[PDB]
């Protein structure tokens, strides 16, 4: 036989940007939820060129979607 050992990362962070400024209009975040719903998470180019059509800004996105990811998500440990 043969299976991995051990395979740890070299080094890993975490950042959080709790911040209560940003603000999306009603425009922006139905084309936000949009976009993010058909695609969990889009690519390089086509990231931009959606912040293009609604003119936000490419790190709107990739937070956002990050931060929507979260609740996108859903863990059961035990109900009850």
């Given at each position: 036989?043969?299976?991995?050992?051990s395979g740890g990362e070299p080094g890993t962070k975490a950042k959080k940007g709790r911040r209560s400024r940003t603000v999306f209009t009603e425009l922006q975040l139905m084309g936000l939820?949009?976009?993010?719903?058909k695609?969990?998470?889009?690519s390089?180019?086509?990231?931009?060129d959606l912040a293009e059509s609604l003119?936000?800004?490419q790190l709107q996105v990739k937070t956002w979607y990050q931060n929507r990811r979260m609740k996108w998500k859903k863990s059961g440990p035990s109900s009850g």
């Open positions: 036989g043969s299976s991995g050992s939820e949009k976009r993010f719903e695609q969990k998470y889009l390089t180019p086509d990231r931009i003119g936000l800004s």
